[PDB]
Design a protein around this nucleic acid. Structure first.
Ligand code: MG
Ligand code: MG
Ligand code: MG
Ligand code: MG
Ligand code: MG
Ligand code: MG
Ligand code: MG
Ligand code: MG
Ligand code: MG
Ligand code: ZN
Lengths: 106, 93, 99, 69, 50
RNA sequence: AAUCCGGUUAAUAUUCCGGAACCAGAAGGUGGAAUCAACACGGCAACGUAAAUGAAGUUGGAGACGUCGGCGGGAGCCCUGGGAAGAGUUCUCUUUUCUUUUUAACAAACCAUUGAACUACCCUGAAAUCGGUUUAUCCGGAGCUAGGGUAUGGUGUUUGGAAGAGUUCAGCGCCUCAUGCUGAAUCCGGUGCGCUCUCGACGGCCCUUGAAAAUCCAACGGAAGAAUGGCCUUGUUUUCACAUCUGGUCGUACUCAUAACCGCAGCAGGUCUCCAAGGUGAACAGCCUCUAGUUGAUAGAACAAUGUAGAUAAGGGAAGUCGGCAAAAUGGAUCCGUAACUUCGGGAUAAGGAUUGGCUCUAAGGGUUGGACAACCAACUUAGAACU
């Protein structure tokens, strides 16, 4: 059956030599050279992948509109929803404790 | 079924290396692959990742603990902590 | 459930080479229904002559390539190969050509 | 290539200045494709009716170049 | 290798040019002994060595 | 950062031609959006949108990473049931056998439906008679099961591209020319412990835990802005749509090896890697075949001894020899059975037995699907019986 060749002079199965088979409108079986798969941004506090954002190679993110690269919320696109919620509650409670410790210091 | 009377996990080594060596490895290997209890969360989801590093699973307490090579805590570390706590509590008062 | 298979054979009959009469009984004896020869109980495959046509009517979703296969056998039985050839012309219609 | 699903949308793209030419493709299934060549994209509208195709062809801007395949 | 530098390619062009017969009228000159040359290089025989 | 298909030459092609795209940079050419005082709305939420001002500084992310094991999906290949077109065979038989039956980048909308998710997260709710659940035992009052949502999205679907291309077949002009012109088909189904690649969710292992940088993105922050006469009047946004300009320079033939490289040579040596059909079979084994390639290794005649390579041998069976050297014998699979010794893991395929074809049957083991049930379709095993 039809056998294929690399379309570039790179002759080795490296991570930059990824391929997949296409069947053409000439009934030809041949390679298509494809890129590495994208990656979803990860939360800065927990490392979880961030929801609402596609998996792209780094420079592909330069072509999206602003709102596709973020979530409409504080730290959107940088922190997960549950991480932000921990930060808000932690900030409030710590500030209140600083208030009582200041009040009881006098 | 039992499948082994003695060698246990060390059965992977077969007849090599000497019985005493396989027995010593056996005691340590049972320790280093055991599950331990997380003091901060209460679950038994504490397993080793590389020799002194013990991690936790779940959505809560994704923390990492510095521990012993083969167990989460060592006797020397536990004795040091109580020694340190006694010394701390005697200069405090 | 009506089919209009015709084996037009004008070319060879004009030269007195093709016996449509012989081809009639050849088909009726040879056409196989349900894996058997002689199961043309006239409910499924009829066949008939059209002067120069051997029109076959089918009711069991037949194959016109089966007609071409049986025709080439007949031409082979009478050493008509090298001289005649069955060629598709229209939907379900085949012709004999000398080429 | 981009598909246009609305006749109103297709006519608007034709009235634009980048719209150089149009193509009429008549498929075997009696369906008609109106293809509009802009600078960046080729826009196809699929019209499944012969009556609608005639009206749409008459609905084009008069100066538009409509070419028959 | 077909992957080649410009400098290498220039040298190959020159090597091919010097690898030509001398026109006969050169050897027909009065006082010339250019009749045969030991500089006819062939690709399989004597290698360029860059 | 970013390119695909079809065609084309004697000889180049992801570079030429036809068609269809994409990326980056510059200027700002239109359109749209927000702003009457300021930089939008929706959703309980996960989060959503055609746009939705954001300077310094800071912080976060991507780039960015081992290895083995099985499991689930996709694509191409393989196999199979019909139809069509042409071909092979045709004493006889063969509703036959063979070939062709194709669909790219890119764009859009959907999307666990049709194949692969409760994978992650959110909401309601509050679980012992504990339940859920994978091939693999993990998960839950730190909120299970369940119900409903949100996101991730193609090598999936439906389309655009695109039948106009490609393929197959049948005719017409017939010195024919620009080799033109005219008709048909290119359709509908199924399959998987298969093969190659790939993705997804996992599991094992380590005194081994498996680059860096360029580059791109996001946030925190708040710098700066100046429309106003209830309206003809600006800035921003070009991280929104359409449009314009520009993309230099070097490589690109061919061989990659039993004749293009190295080995003095057209040397049985050596030299990294990608694709990979059918049958048998556990199998990328051996053996035969299809596509492709080759039929090249000075030839002719003859059949002496002695050779090199390969076979066989009565009876005996290691007497040969330093020595069983060489050869012979054994061999796959299934079912029986398996000693000393042992570091208890092994020894072990120990040893030692039996069986194995063909044909015709029987039984059991799963899925789609119509009104305790069931007519097909799609299937693969295993065990046994009779006959020969
Ligand atoms: Mg070439
Ligand atoms: Mg080349
Ligand atoms: Mg050499
Ligand atoms: Mg003997
Ligand atoms: Mg004997
Ligand atoms: Mg004997
Ligand atoms: Mg002896
Ligand atoms: Mg002797
Ligand atoms: Mg030997
Ligand atoms: Zn814990």
């Amino acid at each position: 059956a039809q056998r294929v060749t690399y379309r570039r002079r790179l002759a080795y199965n490296t991570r930059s030599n990824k391929t997949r088979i296409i069947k053409t409108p000439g009934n030809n079986i041949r390679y298509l050279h494809i890129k590495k798969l994208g990656t979803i941004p990860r939360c800065g506090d927990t490392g979880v992948p961030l929801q609402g954002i596609p998996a792209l190679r780094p420079r592909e993110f330069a072509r999206l509109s602003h709102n596709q690269k973020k979530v409409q919320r504080a730290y959107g696109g940088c922190l997960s929803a549950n991480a932000v919620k921990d930060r808000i509650v932690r900030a409030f409670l710590i500030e209140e404790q600083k208030i009582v410790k200041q009040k009881l210091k006098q | 079924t039992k499948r082994t009377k003695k060698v246990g996990v060390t059965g992977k080594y077969g007849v090599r290396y000497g019985a005493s060596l396989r027995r010593d490895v056996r005691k340590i290997e049972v320790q280093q692959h055991s599950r331990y209890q997380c003091p901060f969360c209460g679950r038994n989801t504490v397993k080793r990742t590389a020799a002194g590093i013990w991690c936790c699973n779940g959505k809560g307490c994704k923390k990492v603990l510095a521990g012993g090579a083969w167990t989460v805590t060592t006797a020397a570390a536990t004795s040091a902590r109580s020694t340190i706590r006694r010394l701390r509590e005697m200069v405090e008062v | 459930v009506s089919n209009k298979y015709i084996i037009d054979a004008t070319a060879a009959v004009n030269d007195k080479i093709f016996d449509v009469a012989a081809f009639e009984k050849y088909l009726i004896d040879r056409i196989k229904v349900d894996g058997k020869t002689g199961n043309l109980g006239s409910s499924v495959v009829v066949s008939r002559e059209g002067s120069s046509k051997i029109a076959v009517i089918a009711h069991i979703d037949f194959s016109g390539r089966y007609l071409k296969y049986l025709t080439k056998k007949f031409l082979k039985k009478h050493s008509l190969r090298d001289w005649l050839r069955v060629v598709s012309t229209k939907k379900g219609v085949y012709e004999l050509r000398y080429y | 290539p981009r598909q246009i699903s609305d006749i109103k949308q297709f006519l608007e793209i034709a009235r634009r200045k980048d719209a150089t030419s149009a193509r009429i493709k008549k498929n075997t299934n009696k369906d008609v494709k109106f293809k509009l060549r802009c600078s960046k994209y080729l826009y196809t509208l699929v019209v499944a009716d012969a009556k609608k195709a005639e009206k749409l062809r008459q609905s084009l801007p008069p100066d538009l170049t409509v070419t028959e395949v | 290798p077909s992957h080649k530098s410009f400098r290498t390619k220039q040298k190959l062009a020159k090597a091919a040019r010097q690898n030509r017969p001398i026109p006969q009228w050169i050897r027909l000159r009065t006082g010339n002994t250019v009749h045969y040359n030991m500089k006819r290089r062939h690709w399989r025989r004597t290698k360029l060595n860059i």
